[PDB]
Amino acid sequence: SGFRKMAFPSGKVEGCMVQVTCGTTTLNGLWLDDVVYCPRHVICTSEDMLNPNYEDLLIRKSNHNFLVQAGNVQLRVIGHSMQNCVLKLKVDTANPKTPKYKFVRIQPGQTFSVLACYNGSPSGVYQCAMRPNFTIKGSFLNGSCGSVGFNIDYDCVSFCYMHHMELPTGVHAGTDLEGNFYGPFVDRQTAQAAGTDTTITVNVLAWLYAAVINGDRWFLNRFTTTLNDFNLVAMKYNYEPLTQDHVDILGPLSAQTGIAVLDMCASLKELLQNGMNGRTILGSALLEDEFTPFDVVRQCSGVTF
Amino acid sequence: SGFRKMAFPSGKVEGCMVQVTCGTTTLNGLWLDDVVYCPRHVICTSEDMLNPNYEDLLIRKSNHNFLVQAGNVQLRVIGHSMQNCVLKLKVDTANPKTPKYKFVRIQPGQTFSVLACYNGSPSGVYQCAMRPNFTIKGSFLNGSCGSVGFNIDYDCVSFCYMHHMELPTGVHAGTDLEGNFYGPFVDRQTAQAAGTDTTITVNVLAWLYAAVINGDRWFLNRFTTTLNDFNLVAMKYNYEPLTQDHVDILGPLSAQTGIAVLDMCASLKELLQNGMNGRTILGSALLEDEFTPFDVVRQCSG
Ligand SMILES: *[C@H](O)[C@H](CC(C)C)NC(=O)[C@H](CC(C)C)NC(=O)[C@H](CC(C)C)NC(=O)OCc1ccccc1
Ligand SMILES: *[C@H](O)[C@H](CC(C)C)NC(=O)[C@H](CC(C)C)NC(=O)[C@H](CC(C)C)NC(=O)OCc1ccccc1
Ligand SMILES: [Cl-]
């Protein structure tokens, strides 16, 4: 037993991380087959980070202007192209360590593992969620751009995130691997702010199921609620409305534990209205919302990759 | 910026995980050079787990009673021996993915990453601290024994933990890679309990510095304290004593932030006696004690 904020094993992604240097700027790229993907702002200049004409800046560059490395193995770039806010740099060497992969664009509320890197060297791994406002709360320093976020399924790595920027508040914004930002942000240092951060209700309920599974039962009660009455209380605390789809995906956890979804909603209603009264749930004093129902089943059933 | 509970990249350890089966007990082993390390309780029988005599249980065993699988590949056991609470299975193939590594003994308060595995395959990676009572708070199911904990130092994998058991409360216990337990535990299903858990004071202070570095400073005050007066408060709240060595270790963070160590101690004292009044620090409503001073520096600057 035990329940922890758990990342995917990173070995398959580690073997795809490289370092990309354009002039002074250095960041991380993802090496898959004969292509390296990285954030396009690697071409920017010191005094042109407000209104960069990325098209015009790139056509003026050349293949050699991009210095790429597999740690201690330099890569020759033999072609470059822009796709939205990412660059595709063709190289003469296919990555022998390329995994089975696909590019996916995740939905708010879903989770992924971030492999934080610097100078193409993996530094740490942690689990993040896509917030309802299309930001993530990560840990990213200068040089971390190009770090990727991913999931694993069987043997296939689904890449969903590339890191590009930090907004004031310490929240992080990036693109999918097609180069399109999550949310309305742009890769310019013009003033931008995130929208309302709401709590992912379906995930809080999943984590309450995880707690029961791992022996914390004190918040269970003998009340029930209707979904209608639960949602009127959720709204007041800036929780996502709980939909029938959410009830559906909580089904398996409800069946494993013997606690109906709306009975767990009644527990959450009480926790919202009255707090924890100095107790804790799975070592936390707050209601945690960065575990999905699948994350709970995955960890509690011990599935491997 | 940002501050998260961060594990080390696990790839170098993934290439070392194998599956070990004896009878109907399956757990994980660590394949380094031509040796596979695994908990010795892989040889117990279902009916003989309260009080196994491991010397007697080995009397029967042959090399071929140990089925070792590296993924699909089958590894041939050519010798076996017992060392403390681990087995060493000599196999006929050296692991071609063996990293540069060392076996290290960690002390309470220190942190490491765990790669949780089942059937020799990885499930997930997370960060743990060795608690003062010599347990860890992990996520381990049946079949997870032999999963290891480690730190990565530049090019070197330092293995410090191998998982063997769970005490009630969801509390985890194991050995180092020499096979000697952390704490007073034995690999026996006889009743055992960890000492009451206490909070790693020096680590809380480090995390408070991480918070300041990352823009959370509402808990800083005008008060100061003495080491002695702070420890009177620590004891009452079941915190570990803070020593002068701990103060020395917090020096670099104190110099980076301009907040004297005993001034941060005064902030912690007020948080202990007053709570957070509905506020949070680095996204937490509790005082976190599983980041070391070195963890903070590494994450905030690296
Ligand atoms: C890439 O490694 C790096 C990672 C961050 C964690 C710093 N990102 C950038 O350097 C990035 C480059 C631009 C051209 C996309 N800029 C930012 O992320 C930037 C950092 C701040 C702290 C200066 N933030 C930013 O431009 O946000 C928009 C903004 C601008 C002005 C006021 C509010 C918000
Ligand atoms: C190894 O895969 C597995 C991992 C655990 C997370 C289940 N560990 C064991 O099977 C281990 C083997 C023994 C011989 C060391 N036993 C335990 O860890 C055992 C688990 C419970 C579920 C029985 N714990 C145990 O015996 O703790 C001591 C104890 C015994 C009786 C009463 C209180 C405490
Ligand atoms: Cl908390």
XYZ file of C-alpha atoms and ligand atoms in Angstrom:
676
model
C 0.000 0.000 0.000
C 0.860 3.699 0.016
C -0.020 6.387 -2.525
C 2.517 8.820 -4.003
C 2.680 11.469 -6.739
C 4.340 9.084 -9.165
C 5.994 9.755 -12.515
C 6.435 7.403 -15.429
C 9.849 5.781 -15.827
C 11.856 8.184 -17.966
C 14.449 5.952 -19.630
C 12.771 6.012 -23.035
C 12.561 9.801 -23.081
C 16.097 10.269 -21.726
C 17.444 8.592 -24.856
C 15.804 11.269 -26.989
C 17.034 14.449 -25.259
C 19.649 16.608 -26.997
C 21.051 20.122 -26.627
C 20.324 22.799 -29.243
C 22.407 25.976 -29.407
C 21.608 28.899 -31.713
C 24.206 31.606 -31.155
C 24.055 32.450 -27.456
C 20.763 30.747 -26.549
C 20.919 27.077 -25.515
C 17.934 24.841 -24.727
C 16.713 21.265 -25.110
C 15.471 19.390 -28.139
C 13.741 16.066 -28.707
C 15.539 13.722 -31.125
C 13.204 11.293 -32.896
C 14.292 9.510 -36.096
C 16.237 12.057 -38.217
C 14.510 15.103 -36.690
C 15.102 17.278 -33.615
C 12.128 19.266 -32.263
C 12.781 22.344 -30.132
C 11.161 25.670 -29.208
C 11.477 28.206 -31.992
C 12.494 30.994 -29.641
C 16.016 29.528 -29.683
C 16.551 31.773 -32.726
C 15.515 34.974 -30.925
C 17.972 37.737 -30.079
C 18.580 39.658 -26.867
C 16.756 42.811 -28.008
C 14.042 41.121 -30.120
C 12.062 39.074 -27.577
C 8.957 41.340 -27.696
C 7.887 41.218 -31.376
C 10.048 38.592 -33.133
C 9.241 37.882 -36.785
C 9.978 34.186 -36.510
C 9.352 33.477 -40.199
C 11.806 36.179 -41.253
C 14.310 35.217 -38.573
C 14.350 31.560 -39.651
C 14.550 31.825 -43.457
C 17.650 33.955 -42.780
C 19.308 31.179 -40.745
C 21.214 28.199 -42.145
C 21.565 24.553 -41.171
C 24.993 24.962 -39.552
C 23.782 27.873 -37.407
C 22.075 25.215 -35.262
C 24.502 23.262 -33.059
C 22.999 19.974 -31.798
C 24.454 17.285 -29.534
C 23.750 13.795 -28.183
C 25.656 14.523 -24.981
C 29.161 14.046 -26.383
C 28.158 13.385 -30.007
C 27.638 16.402 -32.246
C 24.839 16.180 -34.821
C 24.937 17.822 -38.241
C 21.705 19.615 -39.143
C 20.810 19.074 -42.811
C 17.460 20.891 -42.940
C 15.250 23.205 -40.885
C 11.572 24.111 -40.899
C 9.090 25.839 -38.632
C 5.811 24.306 -37.487
C 3.866 26.802 -35.330
C 6.058 27.552 -32.266
C 8.484 24.639 -32.680
C 11.343 24.001 -35.075
C 11.888 20.703 -36.904
C 15.653 20.342 -37.492
C 16.516 17.470 -39.823
C 19.781 15.727 -38.945
C 21.889 13.223 -40.855
C 21.725 10.582 -38.081
C 18.563 8.746 -37.087
C 18.323 8.339 -33.324
C 19.047 4.633 -32.677
C 17.205 5.064 -29.361
C 13.948 6.360 -30.851
C 11.045 4.681 -29.011
C 7.610 3.798 -30.274
C 5.977 7.203 -29.907
C 3.107 9.431 -30.915
C 2.261 13.118 -30.539
C -0.948 13.780 -28.583
C -2.664 16.937 -27.341
C -4.042 16.316 -23.865
C -7.202 17.746 -22.304
C -7.346 19.899 -19.174
C -7.560 17.665 -16.152
C -5.230 15.055 -17.623
C -1.786 14.344 -16.202
C 1.666 13.615 -17.565
C 5.268 13.249 -16.492
C 7.769 16.046 -17.122
C 11.427 15.171 -17.760
C 13.161 18.394 -16.739
C 16.412 18.895 -18.672
C 19.265 21.405 -18.932
C 21.862 21.527 -21.714
C 20.324 18.365 -23.080
C 20.974 16.494 -19.805
C 17.947 15.050 -17.968
C 17.784 16.466 -14.439
C 14.623 15.172 -12.783
C 11.178 13.769 -13.391
C 7.848 14.707 -11.824
C 4.115 14.470 -12.471
C 2.042 17.483 -13.607
C -1.561 18.149 -14.581
C -2.912 20.340 -17.376
C -4.821 22.931 -15.362
C -8.271 24.066 -16.529
C -6.617 27.338 -17.569
C -4.100 25.440 -19.761
C -1.075 26.108 -17.563
C 0.925 23.657 -15.480
C 2.594 24.092 -12.104
C 6.047 22.753 -12.739
C 9.636 23.377 -11.750
C 11.523 25.053 -14.596
C 14.642 27.232 -14.573
C 16.378 29.153 -17.338
C 17.604 26.606 -19.856
C 14.717 24.213 -19.254
C 12.837 25.025 -22.468
C 12.457 22.032 -24.734
C 11.887 19.744 -21.773
C 9.012 17.464 -22.695
C 6.015 15.960 -20.971
C 4.767 12.497 -21.729
C 2.764 9.418 -20.868
C 3.594 5.764 -21.468
C 1.164 3.022 -22.497
C 2.389 -0.539 -22.955
C 5.530 0.331 -24.948
C 4.434 3.563 -26.677
C 5.502 7.010 -25.449
C 2.813 9.651 -26.029
C 4.492 13.074 -26.074
C 2.084 15.841 -25.062
C 4.084 18.862 -23.847
C 7.156 20.955 -24.683
C 8.107 23.723 -22.248
C 8.348 27.329 -23.483
C 7.651 29.953 -20.789
C 6.713 31.007 -17.265
C 3.989 33.445 -16.367
C 4.064 35.559 -13.174
C 2.749 33.380 -10.329
C 5.317 30.745 -11.273
C 3.014 28.943 -13.691
C 4.254 27.372 -16.859
C 3.027 27.410 -20.438
C 4.003 25.388 -23.483
C 2.965 23.641 -26.673
C 2.049 20.216 -27.895
C 4.555 18.653 -30.279
C 2.616 20.087 -33.287
C 3.886 23.412 -31.892
C 0.511 24.831 -30.819
C 0.361 26.396 -27.372
C -1.928 25.031 -24.743
C -4.179 27.988 -23.990
C -4.068 31.470 -25.553
C -0.389 32.204 -24.870
C 2.253 33.285 -27.403
C 6.037 32.859 -27.334
C 6.689 36.588 -26.962
C 7.628 38.468 -23.783
C 4.464 40.575 -23.947
C 2.211 40.752 -20.899
C 0.046 37.645 -20.586
C -1.884 36.242 -17.651
C -3.522 32.926 -16.959
C -7.248 32.559 -16.456
C -9.205 31.147 -13.543
C -7.561 28.122 -11.941
C -10.462 25.873 -10.941
C -10.198 22.608 -9.049
C -10.519 19.366 -11.031
C -13.434 17.769 -9.193
C -13.254 14.358 -10.894
C -9.609 14.054 -9.818
C -10.280 15.019 -6.195
C -12.860 12.237 -6.083
C -10.387 9.789 -7.622
C -7.839 10.667 -4.917
C -10.478 10.169 -2.221
C -10.989 6.670 -3.642
C -7.205 6.181 -3.525
C -7.247 7.155 0.154
C -9.976 4.628 0.996
C -8.045 1.943 -0.886
C -4.981 2.766 1.212
C -6.819 2.822 4.553
C -7.954 6.435 5.143
C -11.719 6.131 5.733
C -12.472 8.914 8.226
C -14.237 11.212 5.711
C -16.788 8.574 4.687
C -20.259 9.334 6.009
C -23.800 8.001 5.853
C -25.150 10.795 3.667
C -25.767 10.916 -0.039
C -26.372 13.718 -2.486
C -27.836 14.198 -5.886
C -25.411 15.291 -8.582
C -27.453 18.501 -8.917
C -27.058 19.384 -5.243
C -23.393 18.389 -5.252
C -22.696 20.726 -8.172
C -24.400 23.705 -6.546
C -21.860 23.331 -3.725
C -18.926 22.724 -6.089
C -19.645 25.986 -7.945
C -19.294 27.920 -4.693
C -15.743 26.619 -4.124
C -14.553 27.034 -7.740
C -14.748 23.335 -8.537
C -15.411 22.101 -12.075
C -19.008 20.910 -12.548
C -19.142 17.118 -12.257
C -20.668 15.582 -15.392
C -22.101 12.194 -16.265
C -18.888 11.463 -18.160
C -16.966 12.068 -14.924
C -19.336 9.796 -13.011
C -18.745 7.184 -15.715
C -14.964 7.330 -15.447
C -15.125 7.067 -11.629
C -17.141 3.848 -12.069
C -14.322 1.310 -11.684
C -13.035 2.920 -8.482
C -16.580 2.997 -7.116
C -16.947 -0.699 -7.911
C -13.588 -1.669 -6.392
C -14.325 0.146 -3.122
C -18.067 -0.396 -2.703
C -18.691 3.345 -2.353
C -21.104 4.875 -4.856
C -19.872 7.945 -6.713
C -22.593 10.115 -5.195
C -21.708 8.813 -1.718
C -18.141 9.995 -2.286
C -19.576 13.291 -3.564
C -21.404 13.582 -0.225
C -18.071 13.054 1.525
C -16.443 15.748 -0.611
C -19.355 18.122 -0.002
C -18.770 17.814 3.749
C -15.004 18.297 3.357
C -15.604 21.457 1.325
C -18.136 22.909 3.749
C -16.319 21.969 6.952
C -12.663 21.315 6.129
C -10.560 18.480 7.480
C -10.809 19.418 11.172
C -7.055 19.091 11.521
C -6.879 15.616 9.979
C -5.103 14.651 6.764
C -5.774 12.472 3.739
C -2.870 10.515 2.226
C -0.444 12.830 4.006
C -2.097 16.020 2.710
C -3.951 18.875 4.415
C -5.487 19.974 1.076
C -7.786 18.211 -1.391
C -5.453 16.968 -4.164
C -6.586 17.243 -7.787
C -3.599 16.101 -9.896
C -4.425 12.363 -9.895
C -6.836 11.060 -12.528
C -9.032 7.992 -12.038
C -6.659 6.082 -14.319
C -3.599 7.276 -12.376
C -5.170 5.843 -9.219
C -5.970 2.475 -10.809
C -2.549 2.383 -12.485
C -0.661 2.900 -9.243
C -2.915 0.798 -7.004
C -2.952 -2.179 -9.406
C 0.792 -1.924 -10.134
C 0.752 -1.730 -13.948
C 4.180 -1.684 -15.606
C 5.641 -0.545 -18.945
C 10.883 28.954 -10.863
C 8.576 26.475 -9.141
C 9.319 23.780 -6.586
C 8.195 20.164 -6.940
C 9.014 16.833 -5.327
C 11.412 15.652 -8.026
C 12.881 12.194 -8.628
C 16.063 11.431 -10.515
C 15.773 10.184 -14.113
C 15.380 6.427 -13.855
C 16.829 5.150 -17.129
C 20.167 3.972 -15.736
C 18.323 1.906 -13.102
C 15.688 0.536 -15.525
C 18.404 -1.353 -17.423
C 19.300 -3.170 -14.179
C 15.879 -4.519 -13.128
C 15.199 -8.236 -13.552
C 12.571 -10.675 -12.319
C 13.395 -13.425 -9.828
C 11.083 -16.371 -9.112
C 11.577 -19.095 -6.495
C 8.725 -21.545 -6.119
C 5.638 -19.332 -6.404
C 7.220 -16.174 -4.953
C 8.168 -13.547 -7.532
C 9.982 -10.296 -6.859
C 12.533 -8.020 -8.484
C 16.305 -8.216 -8.605
C 19.075 -5.757 -9.437
C 21.419 -6.979 -12.184
C 24.896 -5.413 -11.930
C 27.873 -6.903 -13.767
C 27.255 -10.691 -13.543
C 25.402 -10.663 -10.198
C 21.696 -10.302 -9.400
C 20.807 -8.958 -5.929
C 17.400 -9.632 -4.402
C 15.757 -9.976 -0.985
C 16.461 -13.332 0.568
C 12.813 -13.906 1.486
C 12.238 -14.979 -2.118
C 13.084 -18.480 -0.820
C 10.482 -18.676 1.957
C 7.501 -21.023 1.632
C 3.941 -19.757 2.057
C 3.507 -21.821 5.236
C 6.974 -20.807 6.635
C 7.133 -16.949 6.723
C 6.599 -16.196 10.480
C 9.957 -17.586 11.526
C 12.022 -18.800 8.575
C 15.477 -20.120 9.274
C 17.182 -18.977 6.092
C 20.190 -21.263 6.557
C 17.828 -24.236 6.731
C 15.817 -23.010 3.724
C 18.998 -22.773 1.623
C 19.906 -26.393 2.430
C 17.545 -27.498 -0.324
C 18.057 -24.794 -2.932
C 19.875 -25.414 -6.225
C 20.913 -22.833 -8.809
C 18.037 -23.911 -11.044
C 15.501 -23.150 -8.289
C 16.118 -19.450 -9.118
C 14.375 -18.421 -12.333
C 15.813 -15.057 -13.413
C 14.353 -13.163 -16.376
C 15.686 -9.917 -17.844
C 12.602 -8.841 -19.747
C 12.014 -11.803 -22.031
C 15.628 -12.985 -21.908
C 16.316 -15.838 -19.529
C 19.386 -15.634 -17.316
C 21.217 -18.765 -16.219
C 22.105 -18.860 -12.520
C 25.564 -20.416 -12.077
C 25.928 -19.783 -8.340
C 24.091 -18.383 -5.370
C 24.957 -17.225 -1.873
C 23.381 -15.299 0.979
C 24.810 -12.022 2.286
C 23.005 -10.537 5.301
C 19.358 -10.238 4.137
C 20.015 -10.402 0.372
C 20.865 -13.162 -2.067
C 23.610 -12.812 -4.666
C 22.813 -14.890 -7.765
C 25.842 -15.263 -10.050
C 24.632 -15.441 -13.666
C 26.521 -16.377 -16.833
C 25.869 -13.001 -18.519
C 27.184 -9.640 -17.384
C 24.590 -6.904 -17.684
C 25.627 -4.824 -20.750
C 23.649 -1.873 -19.347
C 25.425 -1.836 -15.981
C 26.034 1.810 -15.021
C 28.852 3.307 -13.060
C 27.530 2.728 -9.566
C 28.314 2.497 -5.869
C 26.474 1.073 -2.862
C 25.932 3.756 -0.200
C 24.388 3.775 3.261
C 22.118 6.757 3.829
C 21.194 8.320 7.158
C 17.826 9.541 8.448
C 16.733 12.757 6.824
C 18.432 12.005 3.506
C 16.398 11.573 0.346
C 16.452 9.212 -2.621
C 14.427 8.151 -5.643
C 12.543 4.845 -5.781
C 11.866 3.009 -9.045
C 8.860 0.845 -8.175
C 8.809 -2.372 -10.200
C 6.722 -5.523 -10.604
C 7.928 -8.647 -12.443
C 11.186 -6.884 -13.276
C 9.358 -4.061 -15.116
C 9.036 -0.406 -14.069
C 5.779 1.014 -12.734
C 6.837 4.503 -11.655
C 9.423 6.700 -10.001
C 9.100 8.890 -6.916
C 11.179 10.643 -4.272
C 11.438 9.412 -0.660
C 13.207 10.350 2.577
C 14.648 7.950 5.146
C 12.504 8.877 8.160
C 14.016 9.276 11.649
C 12.341 5.962 12.586
C 14.171 4.312 9.663
C 11.097 3.742 7.486
C 10.037 5.356 4.225
C 6.603 6.429 3.002
C 6.454 4.779 -0.397
C 4.002 3.097 -2.748
C 4.673 -0.647 -2.764
C 2.336 -3.563 -3.580
C 2.900 -7.299 -3.335
C 5.632 -8.217 -5.802
C 7.452 -4.889 -5.388
C 10.226 -6.258 -3.181
C 13.642 -5.825 -4.696
C 12.726 -2.420 -6.082
C 15.594 -0.082 -5.272
C 16.205 3.479 -4.154
C 19.036 5.580 -5.501
C 20.626 8.952 -6.103
C 22.470 9.976 -9.259
C 25.709 11.903 -8.732
C 27.054 13.277 -12.014
C 27.802 9.991 -13.826
C 27.394 7.631 -10.869
C 24.312 5.753 -9.672
C 24.438 5.473 -5.858
C 22.158 2.638 -4.758
C 21.047 3.043 -1.148
C 17.817 1.060 -0.682
C 16.125 -2.220 -1.561
C 12.539 -2.853 -0.559
C 11.570 -5.792 1.648
C 8.464 -5.163 3.741
C 5.498 -3.077 4.848
C 4.576 -2.414 8.462
C 1.011 -1.466 9.380
C 0.224 2.204 8.651
C 1.444 1.698 5.066
C 5.015 2.072 6.336
C 7.946 0.666 4.352
C 11.184 -0.969 5.461
C 14.179 -2.427 3.706
C 17.928 -2.802 3.463
C 20.896 -1.208 1.800
C 22.526 -3.028 -1.111
C 24.848 -4.854 1.287
C 21.641 -6.383 2.668
C 21.600 -4.764 6.136
C 18.276 -3.306 7.244
C 17.638 0.323 7.928
C 16.399 0.405 11.491
C 15.695 -2.457 13.887
C 13.566 -4.587 11.567
C 13.944 -8.223 10.547
C 12.674 -10.004 7.426
C 10.183 -12.112 9.352
C 6.398 -11.805 9.594
C 6.658 -11.450 13.373
C 5.054 -8.418 14.979
C 7.202 -5.308 14.577
C 6.481 -1.593 14.716
C 8.417 1.520 13.796
C 9.147 4.107 16.437
C 6.718 7.001 16.472
C 7.390 9.218 13.412
C 9.024 12.631 14.007
C 9.534 15.577 11.658
C 12.918 16.279 10.035
C 13.471 19.816 11.287
C 16.500 20.717 9.181
C 14.557 19.689 6.053
C 11.517 21.823 6.954
C 13.852 24.814 7.316
C 15.406 24.074 3.932
C 11.918 23.958 2.353
C 11.060 27.269 3.984
C 14.142 28.688 2.246
C 12.953 27.149 -1.043
C 9.672 28.968 -0.464
C 11.385 32.333 -0.033
C 13.505 31.713 -3.133
C 10.272 31.019 -5.042
C 8.403 34.095 -3.790
C 6.555 32.843 -0.691
C 7.633 35.106 2.178
C 4.486 35.761 4.222
C 5.818 33.666 7.131
C 8.965 35.770 7.693
C 8.770 37.861 10.866
C 10.843 40.192 13.041
C 11.502 37.671 15.762
C 14.625 35.725 16.442
C 15.243 32.791 18.736
C 18.079 30.796 20.207
C 18.914 27.258 19.211
C 17.953 26.189 22.748
C 14.616 28.002 22.825
C 13.766 26.744 19.348
C 14.460 23.156 20.397
C 12.075 23.527 23.340
C 9.336 24.244 20.782
C 10.572 21.531 18.399
C 10.349 18.873 21.101
C 6.769 19.781 21.964
C 5.680 19.363 18.328
C 7.544 16.062 17.817
C 10.280 17.623 15.691
C 13.807 16.249 15.655
C 16.366 18.333 17.564
C 18.131 20.963 15.476
C 21.876 20.860 16.046
C 24.698 23.271 15.356
C 25.785 20.957 12.526
C 22.288 21.441 11.042
C 22.671 25.220 11.367
C 26.009 24.963 9.569
C 24.411 22.910 6.796
C 21.694 25.562 6.310
C 24.342 28.280 5.981
C 24.437 28.433 2.180
C 20.673 28.868 1.916
C 20.796 31.506 4.654
C 23.465 33.416 2.725
C 21.624 33.156 -0.587
C 18.390 34.540 0.888
C 19.762 36.965 3.488
C 17.709 35.303 6.248
C 19.748 34.123 9.236
C 19.128 30.501 10.207
C 17.843 31.393 13.673
C 15.504 33.968 12.074
C 13.961 31.235 9.926
C 13.807 29.102 13.071
C 11.771 31.932 14.597
C 9.416 31.813 11.612
C 9.056 28.045 11.970
C 8.374 28.452 15.697
C 5.495 30.820 14.890
C 4.112 28.444 12.242
C 4.178 25.595 14.758
C 2.395 27.604 17.449
C -0.067 29.446 15.188
C -0.614 27.394 12.033
C -0.841 28.950 8.593
C -4.146 30.839 9.139
C -5.541 29.419 5.921
C -2.429 30.165 3.866
C -0.171 27.785 1.962
C 3.572 27.490 1.352
C 4.699 26.092 -2.019
C 1.241 24.673 -2.590
C 1.102 22.878 0.757
C -0.992 23.311 3.894
C 1.520 21.244 5.915
C 5.184 21.805 6.722
C 7.123 19.557 4.314
C 10.198 17.661 5.554
C 11.297 15.455 2.621
C 13.586 17.985 0.897
C 17.175 18.219 2.094
C 19.185 21.457 1.998
C 21.064 19.977 -0.956
C 17.790 19.095 -2.721
C 16.709 22.736 -2.477
C 19.982 24.079 -3.914
C 19.989 21.499 -6.730
C 16.446 22.288 -7.798
C 16.622 26.083 -7.398
C 19.999 26.321 -9.231
C 21.232 23.556 -11.598
C 13.142 28.885 -21.750
O 14.205 28.077 -21.233
C 12.629 29.839 -20.656
C 12.104 29.066 -19.477
C 11.513 29.944 -18.380
C 11.237 29.097 -17.134
C 12.337 31.174 -18.059
N 11.613 30.718 -21.242
C 11.924 31.936 -21.725
O 13.016 32.432 -21.611
C 10.818 32.695 -22.420
C 11.301 33.114 -23.802
C 10.200 33.785 -24.609
C 10.786 34.503 -25.816
C 9.152 32.759 -25.060
N 10.348 33.872 -21.693
C 9.654 33.749 -20.574
O 9.236 32.653 -20.167
C 9.408 35.020 -19.814
C 10.160 34.910 -18.483
C 9.845 36.056 -17.532
C 10.078 35.634 -16.085
C 10.669 37.290 -17.900
N 8.030 35.308 -19.470
C 7.231 35.958 -20.306
O 7.611 36.552 -21.301
O 5.817 35.951 -19.981
C 4.936 36.885 -20.596
C 4.911 38.144 -19.755
C 5.704 39.238 -20.119
C 5.667 40.392 -19.357
C 4.838 40.459 -18.232
C 4.045 39.374 -17.888
C 4.085 38.218 -18.649
C 7.597 -8.151 -0.964
O 7.216 -8.161 -2.333
C 6.450 -7.704 -0.003
C 6.098 -6.239 -0.225
C 5.001 -5.768 0.741
C 4.581 -4.342 0.385
C 3.786 -6.677 0.801
N 6.859 -8.007 1.367
C 6.636 -9.181 1.976
O 5.975 -10.073 1.462
C 7.218 -9.400 3.352
C 7.911 -10.739 3.430
C 8.506 -11.025 4.810
C 8.987 -12.472 4.915
C 9.652 -10.074 5.139
N 6.263 -9.340 4.429
C 5.724 -8.191 4.804
O 6.153 -7.088 4.425
C 4.553 -8.256 5.758
C 3.328 -7.763 4.983
C 2.013 -7.957 5.711
C 0.877 -7.732 4.708
C 1.876 -9.351 6.313
N 4.808 -7.408 6.879
C 5.131 -7.915 8.073
O 5.210 -9.113 8.317
O 5.374 -6.934 9.098
C 5.651 -7.360 10.445
C 4.366 -7.640 11.198
C 3.855 -8.936 11.225
C 2.698 -9.201 11.936
C 2.047 -8.181 12.615
C 2.543 -6.887 12.553
C 3.710 -6.626 11.851
Cl -0.821 19.753 2.239
